[PDB]
Structure formats: C-alpha cells, structure tokens
C-alpha cells in the first residue's frame, strides 16, 4: 500500500545541476533500500543511485562524483542531487522502495532532458 512520488525533473543546460525528490506515504526508516534508477525509452533501465537505511550509498560507475543521493528523514524524502549533466543523462528517473518485510514499489518517474539552447 505504499506511494512514491518523483518531483524536481525537467530541462537543463549541460553541465547544470537538478535535484530530484522521491516523497514516500511511509515513514522512510521503514523501507529497507530506496533506490533511483532511469530509463530512456528504447534502452534498458539502469540503476542509478541506491540508500539503506543504515545511510550506505552505492552509485553507478557513469554517476560516481556527480550524482549524490540522500535521506531527508524530516521531510520524509530521499534526493538525488544530480550534477554535471549531459545528453547521456536524459531519461525518465525512477524512484524504487524495497520492503523486506519481500516486495517493490515504485513511482511514476520524472523525466530529465539534458539539451543545450
């Protein structure tokens, strides 16, 4: 019965910055991992940026060092700070929660699109 919800996508210049917002109707300490993944239509969905609720974060090899993801307990929402983009960013980011208490949830996404103009 859980609910994710993605915000803060939309257009950026190359090497700009957005983050993202995933705000969760449970208390987030009660998901076991929360994970971004993204994926471009046409191409396989790809895990971006993963958070347990110990606080490990791991991070794909292509985001390491730009992408930051982040509990924020207070406002019940995890972000991903997402710096540097390029076009190899563009896609629609996923928010996924894992409850091991075994199941999945995810959200509707948000779409990125990295274009210079």
């Known amino acids: 019965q859980v609910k994710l919800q993605e915000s803060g996508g939309g257009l950026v210049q190359p090497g700009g ?3 993202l917002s995933c ?3 449970v208390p ?3 998901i076991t991992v929360m994970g971004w993944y993204r994926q471009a239509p046409g191409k396989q969905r790809e895990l971006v940026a993963g958070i347990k609720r110990s606080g490990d974060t791991n991070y794909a ?7 930051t993801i982040s509990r924020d307990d207070a406002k019940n929402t995890v972000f991903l700070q997402m710096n540097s983009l390029t076009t190899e960013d ?3 980011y ?8 075994g199941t999945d949830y995810w959200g509707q996404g948000t779409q990125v699109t990295v274009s210079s103009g």
Do not use: E
Not at 94 to 101: E, K, V
């Open 61 to 67: 090899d292509s985001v390491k060092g730009r992408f």
């Open 17 to 19: 910055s957005l983050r």
């Open 90 to 92: 563009t896609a629609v």
């Open 28 to 30: 987030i300490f009660a």
């Open 23 to 25: 705000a969760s109707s």
């Open 94 to 101: 996923y928010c996924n929660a894992q409850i091991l208490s």
